[model samples]
Target: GVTLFVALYDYEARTEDDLSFHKGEKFQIVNNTEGDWWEARSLTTGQTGYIPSNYVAPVD
Candidate 1:
């Protein structure tokens, strides 16, 4: 499967997972087939976790 990159437009995270991210941060989308949360990895920090799909948008 192809990996997709996306940009975070707002802060989002889960208390137990520490999936937080700042605005404008880019992440490589790993899994988005779930209900509301999508798994991704940070391009800058290499942090991998689940983030709300609404918090990100497709990058180009």
Candidate 2:
């Protein structure tokens, strides 16, 4: 199992389920199997959605 979080500054969601985050907001990485987009859950709202893989980086 993988557990990680990412900081999202600016993002444009492609779908309704996609998460909307603010600068310095951290979202938990849920699934990264997709090549370009990854599934994530917001720590703030607990909402699950997909975000562009390039939009975030490894936390540590």
Candidate 3:
């Protein structure tokens, strides 16, 4: 499936598994079926991890 991108508020990364990003960063969404934590990837850093779903929203 085609990967989706999202951008919204920021997250400081509560743990090692949490993905950190800027507020306006458009992150590549890997998976969202994991409940409240959606898997995402940062194109700028090549980092992938679980991020709070509330911290992100689908890009237009």
Candidate 4:
């Protein structure tokens, strides 16, 4: 088994067009790194994105 670590930021920002995620929340890696981006699925909302590798970590 593998574990991925991630911290969401700015969950409750007052905006309708901006992408927001919760703080201290964990997300699942649905799709691994592709080129310069890593796709992940949010455990809270089931949302996915091509976030940078710097935002993700391998569990220790």
Off by over 4 Å in 3: 1-3
Error of 3 at 31 (Å): 1.1
* Reference-based lDDT, each prediction: 0.75, 0.73, 0.78, 0.56
Q: Give the lDDT of residue 46 in candidate 4.
A: 71
Reference-based TM-score of each model: 0.76, 0.75, 0.80, 0.55
In angstroms, give how far residue 22 of model 1 lies from its true place: 1.1
How many angstroms is residue 53 displaced in model 2 relative to the true structure, after the best TM-score fit?
1.2
Off by over 4 Å in 1: 1-3, 12-14
Candidate 1 lDDT score at position 52: 82
Hey, what RMSD does candidate 2 come out at?
2.1
**Compared with the true structure, what per-residue lDDT tens digits does model 1 show for residues 20-57?**
77788888888888768788888879988888888777
Candidate 4 Cα deviation (angstroms), residue 10: 6.4
Question: Arrange candidates by TM-score, highest first: which order?
Answer: 3, 1, 2, 4
Choose the strongest candidate by lDDT. Answer: 3
Give residue 44's error in model 4 in angstroms: 1.3
- 2-55, model 3: which lDDT tens digit per residue? 465665776787799988888777778888886898888887688898888887
Q: lDDT tens digits, residues 1-60, model 2?
A: 335666646775667967777656677887787667788887778888887777776766
Q: Per-residue error at 2 for model 1, in Å?
A: 7.8
Ranking by lDDT: 3, 1, 2, 4
Better of 1 and 3 by lDDT: 3
Which pairs of residues clash in candidate 4, taking residues 3 or more apart in a chain or in different chains?
Answer: none
